[PDB]
Amino acid sequence: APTLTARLYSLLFRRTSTFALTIVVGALFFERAFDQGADAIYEHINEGKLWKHIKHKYEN
Amino acid sequence: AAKNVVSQFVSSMSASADVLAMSKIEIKLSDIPEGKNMAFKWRGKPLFVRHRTKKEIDQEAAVEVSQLRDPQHDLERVKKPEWVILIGVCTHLGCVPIANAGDFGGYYCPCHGSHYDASGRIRKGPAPLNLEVPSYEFTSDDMVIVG
Amino acid sequence: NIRKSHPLMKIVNNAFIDLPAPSNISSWWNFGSLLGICLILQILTGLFLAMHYTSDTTTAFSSVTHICRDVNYGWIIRYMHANGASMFFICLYMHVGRGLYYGSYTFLETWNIGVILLLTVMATAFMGYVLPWGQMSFWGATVITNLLSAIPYIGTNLVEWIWGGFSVDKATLTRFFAFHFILPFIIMAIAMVHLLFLHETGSNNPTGISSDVDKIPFHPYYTIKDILGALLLILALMLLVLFAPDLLGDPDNYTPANPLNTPPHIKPEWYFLFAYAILRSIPNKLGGVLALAFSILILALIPLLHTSKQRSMMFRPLSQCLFWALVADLLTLTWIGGQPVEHPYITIGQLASVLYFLLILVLMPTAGTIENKLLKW
Amino acid sequence: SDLELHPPSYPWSHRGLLSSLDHTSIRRGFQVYKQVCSSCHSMDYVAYRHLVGVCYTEDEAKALAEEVEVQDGPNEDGEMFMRPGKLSDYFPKPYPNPEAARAANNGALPPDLSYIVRARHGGEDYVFSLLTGYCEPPTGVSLREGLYFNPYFPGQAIGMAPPIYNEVLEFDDGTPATMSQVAKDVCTFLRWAAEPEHDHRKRMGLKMLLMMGLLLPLVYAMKRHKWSVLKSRKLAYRPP
Amino acid sequence: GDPKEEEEEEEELVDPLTTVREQCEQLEKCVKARERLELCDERVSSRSQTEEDCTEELLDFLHARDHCVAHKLFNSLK
Amino acid sequence: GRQFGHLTRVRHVITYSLSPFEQRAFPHYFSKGIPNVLRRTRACILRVAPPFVAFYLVYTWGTQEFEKSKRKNPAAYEN
């Protein structure tokens, strides 16, 4: 039983190759998860959007 | 934060208001002479049309597909033979082709040099693609639109 | 491999990596690099705004709105520019204050170059502000330009010359666009010359005592200290852009052109307030503009008035009190410069104006002399 | 003459830090510009497409644009006719050369358009309180001609006839076109006409504090790490 | 009084700003300003030829009214 | 410029130091920092603060006079 940060260090941080690979792969997900999670926060507090407003007009 | 602000700054150089025009200019084309060439704008981009005289039909009724770079036949190109509906830019660079001045059909992009015909499709030079005139729909024999 | 030999990286290394710097420079020292960031900020956004702005009298106000409504993200770029101009002054002010308090002006050349850099950016921001051809842009342009008319004998040929006509019109908006585009490149060159003279001695520090016995490399230390501080400059800039776009921005520039009608109470941008109050104080044309010029041109007299045997004000209780009285006085000038020329205000405004000069030209130097005596030096 | 009062207190639903607009109220507000304000005030910078995003629908935007006639470009004769109504250039311009608005309204020039932020301190409120606050002209002061009196405005006196409560309506919903309700909507809409970016900006703005709240502590910790070595260093002087 | 005339009161048209103004126009600091106004409102009727204005005494009153107008109002609107 | 190796002469001082990966970046951040800021505050209030309250007092007075003098005014014109 080593620790987490240790595992992370051994497998990914030691080399600048992996270190860099890990962060670019980290940004790809962070951006996607931050945008989503953050939009939903923006929406939940508002709700006088163009969204809910739409619902009213699938017609023409 | 870096690609967000770099994207925004980059996306700013893309077009701004421009989601263009209506066009469809009411065209009467059994109105214009036997076979003269007419050009309008459909978003500020020259659209040129000749009629399609008897003698002129068959120069394009005799095509050739077995030796091309893009596929078709004039009659197979548009919906009705003696009635085609061209645009007018040139797939090479952006030199607007002139009315029946070169070889084959009529077309001929100068700006340097390249050929086309009455169907427009490129046959001789530097340009890689056939040009493009959206659809061709008239409405009735006497009237017309574009696309 | 080596940073030291390559004719190019050698400059970089000697400026940002191996430069020996005081172990003890404070947050107050972060502003010079923030002024550099400001200049670059102004340069990038400035440029992208130039890809869409048009310099003709008619479409000027309009093209700017084209940017804020039509051009993708123009609004964010436009606000960063405007709010970047304010930050730039915030930084100038701190930077110049830091130099006064800590005696940094004793580096003659680099301080003198700084004054030039100060006037250059003020010239730059002025031309900038006129660009959208709003009411204040126009009247502000009219006020400031007319200062030159006070100059004896050649005053009017000069304003008309700078106008390219009989008043701020067509010709002026176009030339101001031009000069406003080139000035920041010229600023950039002066700043490199500023940095050159500074490296000759290296940085000063809070104590005013030589740090050659305790130098550290600019690189790991000030590299990160500067990064952290850039992010702070950024937060403060975004807060404005993203929560308070119009806060420092006068509502009247949101209304086009009126060479016929001057707004009721025209109000300078913010960073001109204190100087505006000084100019206004004195009811005289010539003397106002003279007082105005002197109010800024005084920085270059500062070094002659150093009187203390110590460099910094860190060990100088008297000078410290007078320094803040100076700051408090400037803050008063600011308040007053943004107020109507009337009863309580003109008198307050005249007393603050004598105080500013009274404390720089006489109070500070006398404090220094009594601090020396108190110490038996 | 030189005396005057300032606007009340703003409870808008677009006043706080993060705070969208009630896009339904932006609708109603356009309707107010459409039927009432339009006949006097030019709104030179907005267009039918701009609404597509905000209050209407693609198809709806076209339809509303089609209810007017602009002066379309010349054809072969060197003409100048009229056309159904695009979707690409609002511009119902009530008056040609501005002086025509002066002639009609009598001196007074019906100003600007996409209002607030515009030259009016206390933007939306000033307007709301201007429209909603017409009142009886108190004793001692006459009005050179029955101009029109308004407690707010600069100089309490001048210009525009009180155009609110002539209960024009076409609010679908089932919303009572009352004095106030029509004003709240018109100011709300005018807010969006002056600042269309308003909602995106605060969503970004959110992200800026959220990101800054991550990065600030982190970058700070990076600097302390590297500065550790100096902060805890120990000195000793050992002369002969 | 009576329902059919309530929708007619809705067609004769309705109250928003009025019920709130009336209710605020009613209040402490307000009646005080109105009272200061009413008094000055009289001293100009007095010499109804040759004399000043009463613009100022009016402004004070709106200030107090519209203030509590803004606080309370909007809750009713929609 | 000047380079490490040619700055100045130092004799007899020892500097002991630790690796960043061996120490904390925030040891007693609050335990020792708060007291420290209180102390730097005390050390400078008397010089920094007074000029500003002086401006503050003139700020409130000044505006007070402005309002009462011009607007509010129209005091007596009695006949």
Ligand code: HEM
């Ligand atoms: C419709 C609901 C409407 C609104 C809203 C509106 C707004 C408005 C503002 C905000 C002003 C600004 C006051 C100022 O500049 O400080 C203003 C001014 C004038 N208006 Fe208006 N207006 C609306 C409608 C109309 C209508 C239908 C008319 C014509 C009858 C009209 C007229 C005027 C005039 C004249 C002015 C100028 C006031 C002045 O400076 O003398 N408005 N309006």
Ligand code: HEM
């Ligand atoms: C790279 C050189 C620069 C260029 C090309 C540039 C370009 C422009 C343009 C096109 C405008 C008009 C558009 C608008 O108003 O938004 C403008 C306005 C302005 N710029 Fe610059 N600028 C430059 C450097 C500066 C500098 C050094 C400053 C001073 C910090 C500055 C501060 C301003 C200001 C205050 C305005 C008026 C802003 C407003 O309120 O609209 N810019 N600039």
Ligand code: HEM
């Ligand atoms: C374009 C405007 C300016 C830029 C880009 C600029 C840039 C810098 C930089 C990078 C430093 C290095 C360290 C530090 O942050 O302090 C510095 C130091 C200094 N600058 Fe500037 N500065 C500018 C305006 C000024 C002004 C207006 C003055 C004075 C009128 C000035 C005089 C000095 C002095 C005296 C120092 C000495 C450093 C010290 O004593 O601590 N500079 N500047």
Ligand SMILES: C[C@@]1(c2ccc(Oc3ccccc3)cc2)OC(=O)N(Nc2ccccc2)C1=O
């Ligand atoms: C932004 C601004 C400006 C910019 C730079 C300036 O340069 C100085 C700043 C401080 C001290 C001296 C000059 C001064 C004003 O440009 C401008 O038109 N104004 N507006 C203005 C309003 C009233 C009188 C005079 C000017 C500015 O504030």
Ligand code: FES
């Ligand atoms: S662009 Fe037409 S031949 Fe080159």
